[PDB]
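Minimal example, chain plus benzimidazole.
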Amino acid sequence: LVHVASVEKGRSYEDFQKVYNAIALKLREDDEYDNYIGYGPVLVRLAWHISGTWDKHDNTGGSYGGTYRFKKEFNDPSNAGLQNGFKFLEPIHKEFPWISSGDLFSLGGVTAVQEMQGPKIPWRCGRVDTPEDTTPDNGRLPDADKDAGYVRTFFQRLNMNDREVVALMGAHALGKTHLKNSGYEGGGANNVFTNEFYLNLLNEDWKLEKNDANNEQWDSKSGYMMLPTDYSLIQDPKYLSIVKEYANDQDKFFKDFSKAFEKLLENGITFPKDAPSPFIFKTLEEQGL
Ligand code: HEM
Ligand SMILES: c1ccc2[nH]cnc2c1
Ligand SMILES: c1ccc2[nH]cnc2c1
């Protein structure tokens, strides 16, 4: 199974920076969502869930086909809550109807990371909408109630190694869990991209508690929480070494996240040799907007 990137007809960097800017301006304006967290974190999660269905063995799933727009994937219980990100993007797709769904969903993730003062994430266009029958079945996204061996094995399906997994998990510095979506009771929340996830893991006094959905989670007296899969990163000796490295080096964490997140968004896609180079979008702040 081969998915060849094909540039939206006649489009170039300027066209995509316009779409970036429309998303970024809406993120600034619609600031009330989720108790003033805004839509940044849910857009990062949406970009990851549309990519995280990929299977390296047969090249099914992944971001290329934009299949989240179809009922089966949209209603995956693992995707509960992402409807809010879809609704946010809807008026943008109406304004720029030439952009493919996979491009728009992945670009939403890149825009959110950058606009939340994260690293620059190079991004390539040319995902092509594929038909309803290409939608992957539910159950390809990970459970949260598991241990380090589960996390490591799960991510091998996405061709991610230990360092890539630890860097990607740093996105759990953003946003929060919601009992009604996932069965985990959210704690203190944030909408600025930092390496704080690793500092919190190492520095807080975590207590294993049961929440109102009868699931276990790790809570601290400061009011933060960790999923069992988050806490597994300090139970496994290989993961723990990398957690310490990112807690102590913000720049390294930014650089490794950027590479791993770009790879996640590109898995399954063949780029022709004459495809354009990846784009690096300017933030609103860099444009004086
Ligand atoms: C073992 C892998 C992972 C598990 C089990 C997991 C699980 C979860 C769960 C249960 C939530 C709460 C959803 C809700 O109740 O609304 C969540 C939130 C989130 N996850 Fe993950 N996650 C994983 C990996 C990742 C990765 C790789 C990223 C991005 C690179 C990511 C980004 C996020 C973000 C941004 C949120 C916040 C969403 C919001 O505030 O609405 N996660 N995760
Ligand atoms: C966001 C919202 C609606 C869409 N329909 C097709 N692609 C979309 C992206
Ligand atoms: C999702 C969102 C925020 C989090 N903080 C700690 N773990 C999390 C998972």
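The domain at 142-260 is CATH 1.10.420.10 (Peroxidase; domain 2). The longest strand covers residues 207-210.
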